[PDB]
């Protein structure tokens, strides 16, 4: 730790007038941890293992000197870029834990260093578990492969997981099919702050959490990196929604295009508007209304609202196509 302060004499040692070798702590004058006749600063003997100690400290001041800058090795110049990033994080202990480390209290063998083991807390929670208690609990209480390190692979896997979660959940089911993806898109749009239709990692996380999907920050980092095509870590809402709809089969496309071509010929100048669709639809023929579980007026009202357009808006083929890909997601 900085400045030592755990290699120094303790008050109990001073009061008891303790000597050196019973505990072999080199702090008294004239005694020092000599490896090969020299200090650990010199590369002789067992310096590598002594430098691997949990309580090791090197006397390097944080404020640097001039000759350190002047005298550099070619290897240091080659590998300095990674060193600057690698020096950001390091484990730290308080003084009581350092006292425990120096006194080497709880160890299976003399060289066992449990404080340097990153899996210690899960070991502690995992301790004192018996085979039967794990294997004989209460019986009531108890994926397409994707290959490659490419970010596109990660994005595809995450998209598939999200789609499966939405199918099993099915929030916001309406009287007319096609409201799940609408709710997800609206939730994403609501958390945009700028107005240009792009999102970053944190807003993506908040939006997908509001939409009902359980995620984490690394998931959103991977997704935004995978779907990025212009190098700015911005996520386009249109692109992600198009990927959430998925690949479309041929029969559904054929029916959609046939219906659109039929509707085109019944209008003037081949321009179709939304009130045409509202007037011409035959809502009382669905299986959900003839069986007797959804009223016809409610179904028509649900259909009219899902377009998110005024009654005089021009409905192109793109809007019709997208609307009925959204609806096919539930059938």
């Amino acid at each position: 730790m900085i400045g030592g302060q755990h290699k120094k004499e303790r008050i109990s040692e001073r009061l008891q007038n303790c000597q050196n070798q019973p505990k072999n702590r080199c702090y008294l004058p004239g005694t020092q941890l000599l490896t090969g006749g020299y200090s650990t600063k010199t590369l002789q003997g067992n310096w590598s293992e002594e430098r691997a100690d949990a309580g090791y400290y090197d006397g390097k001041a944080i404020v640097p000197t001039h000759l350190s800058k002047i005298w550099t090795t070619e290897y240091t110049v080659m590998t300095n870029h990674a060193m600057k990033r690698a020096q950001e994080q390091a484990p730290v202990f308080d003084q009581a834990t350092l006292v425990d480390i120096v006194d080497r209290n709880h160890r299976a063998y003399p060289t066992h260093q449990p404080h340097l083991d990153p899996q210690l807390p899960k070991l502690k929670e995992e301790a004192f578990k018996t085979t039967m208690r794990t294997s004989f609990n209460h019986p009531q209480e108890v994926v397409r492969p994707v290959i490659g390190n490419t970010p596109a692979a990660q994005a595809r896997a995450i998209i598939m997981r999200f789609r499966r979660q939405l199918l099993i959940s099915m929030e916001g089911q309406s009287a007319f099919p096609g409201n799940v993806l609408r709710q997800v898109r609206l939730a994403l749009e609501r958390n945009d702050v700028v107005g240009n239709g792009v999102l970053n990692v944190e807003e993506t996380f908040r939006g997908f959490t509001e939409a009902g999907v359980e995620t984490s920050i690394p998931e959103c980092v991977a997704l935004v990196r995978g779907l990025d095509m212009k190098g700015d870590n911005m996520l386009s809402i249109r692109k992600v929604m198009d990927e959430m709809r998925g690949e479309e089969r041929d029969r559904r496309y054929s029916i959609i295009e046939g219906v659109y071509e039929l509707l085109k010929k019944l209008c003037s100048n081949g321009v179709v508007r939304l009130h045409h669709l509202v007037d011409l639809i035959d809502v009382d023929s669905m299986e959900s209304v003839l069986n007797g579980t959804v009223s016809s007026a409610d179904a028509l009202r649900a259909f009219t609202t899902q377009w998110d357009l005024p009654l005089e808006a021009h409905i192109s083929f793109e809007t019709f196509h997208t609307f009925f890909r959204d609806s096919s997601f539930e059938l």
Binding site: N24, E49, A108, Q113, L123, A127, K129, T131
Partner: protein
């Protein structure tokens, strides 16, 4: 099923302090003696090593014996020393003087009755008593003489229980005392008749463990005693925790001893790795088994590669599959078939316990019955024959009162033990 511990002499008291630190840590006992653990699994077998004191406290079932109180003042001053019961410390007023005859005949017979009274008071308190465990050095004076006297008396008073010993034997390279051969010879003669199971440790082997495997720059006796405390606390783990295949000291003896005199065993503990390397290699059953059979990891100077295994036992701690353990033990027996005695169809017993030591995912302790134990005794007998032909220091022993005939009997008995191991090493089916 309770064990009673006896700690004798300087080495025994020092190893015992580290052992009781390890056991108190594993069961979450504070150095004040208060239970502070975090799972009920720790409490249901606390009785095995601890007695219950009234409010929160637990007291350890151990007897401390020594001829000069210097060690007792050192152990009472240690970090866990307060836990020990005051009435369990028995001491005299003058040292053993490194002499077996003084420790066995003059101050031994004077103090032994008070120690037997304490051991009986401790023994009769158990609801069901398991074997005794003894720690002592064979090269010393009070450890060898009074330890073997006490072992003989407890074997007379409790012949149906188990007798287990951990024993320190003189290194082949540097002596700490000039008269080591006499004390060692008399002690091995007493042990081969009295003991049920005996473990032997060379300090040179612990130095080689520290320097080659752990790469410590300046090891101390605390490290050697920590390795010993680790294996001793490990052998009894299946007695005091649940597991898929429970084991017991009597079950170990029944599987390890083919004939009653062949009860001297070698020890090893597997997870050992340097402070720099531990982040670089994960624990797994193949890694533990390969280190477990490497002779570099065995705590005696004789190496198994010059002998053959009659029998061996491995106790594994942790949640792991039994198939991997069984297939590893089959693979090691099949690939190295020349090193296993052929008239026994399966030499290794396995046992599995669910709870590993804190901070380790898995661990195994290994006990081995190998004929290479004959090499240590032969070397001690050589040094004895060089010293005895010239009566090098015999007047001390004769002045205490010993007859020279005891030396010739002890030499003959050790020579017969070496001969019996050598004959089974070179035995054949015919």
């Amino acid at each position: 099923r309770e064990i009673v511990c006896v700690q004798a002499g300087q080495c025994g008291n020092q190893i015992g302090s580290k052992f009781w630190e390890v056991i108190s840590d594993e069961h979450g006992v504070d150095p004040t003696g208060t239970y502070q653990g975090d799972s009920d699994l720790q409490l249901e077998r606390i009785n095995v090593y601890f007695d219950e004191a009234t409010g929160g406290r637990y007291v350890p079932r151990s007897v401390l014996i020594d001829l000069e109180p210097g060690t007792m003042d050192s152990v009472r001053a240690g970090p866990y020393g307060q836990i020990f019961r005051p009435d369990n410390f028995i001491f005299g007023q003058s040292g053993a003087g490194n002499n077996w005859a003084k420790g066995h005949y003059t101050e031994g017979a004077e103090l032994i009755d008070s120690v037997l009274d304490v051991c009986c008071k401790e023994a009769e308190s158990c609801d069901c008593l398991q074997g005794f465990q003894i720690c002592h050095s064979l090269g010393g004076g009070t450890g060898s003489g009074m330890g073997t006297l006490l072992i003989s008396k407890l074997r007379e008073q409790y012949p149906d229980r188990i007798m287990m010993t951990f024993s320190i034997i003189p290194s082949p390279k540097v002596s700490d005392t000039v008269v080591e051969p006499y004390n060692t010879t008399l002690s091995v003669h007493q042990l081969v008749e009295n003991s049920d199971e005996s473990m032997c440790i060379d300090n040179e082997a612990l130095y080689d463990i520290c320097f080659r495997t752990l790469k410590l720059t300046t090891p101390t006796f605390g490290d050697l005693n920590h390795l010993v405390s680790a294996v001793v606390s490990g052998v009894t783990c299946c007695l005091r925790f649940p597991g898929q295949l429970n084991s017991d000291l009597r079950k170990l003896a029944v599987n390890l001893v083919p004939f009653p005199r062949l009860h001297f065993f070698m020890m090893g503990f597997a997870p050992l790795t340097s402070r720099g390397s531990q982040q670089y290699r994960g624990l797994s059953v193949p890694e533990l088994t390969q280190q477990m059979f490497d002779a570099k990891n065995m705590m005696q100077a004789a190496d198994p590669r010059h002998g053959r295994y009659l029998t061996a036992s491995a106790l594994f701690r942790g949640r792991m599959s039994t198939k991997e353990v069984d297939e590893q033990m089959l693979n090691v027996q099949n690939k190295n078939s020349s090193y296993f005695i052929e008239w026994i169809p399966n030499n290794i017993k396995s046992s599995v316990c669910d709870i590993p030591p804190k901070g380790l995912k898995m661990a195994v302790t290994f006990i081995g019955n190998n004929t290479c134990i004959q090499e240590m005794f032969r070397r001690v007998g050589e040094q004895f024959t060089l010293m005895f032909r010239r009566k090098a220091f015999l007047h001390w022993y004769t002045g205490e009162g010993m007859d020279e005939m005891e030396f010739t009997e002890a030499e003959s008995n050790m020579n017969d033990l070496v001969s019996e191991y050598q004959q089974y090493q070179d035995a054949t089916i015919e």
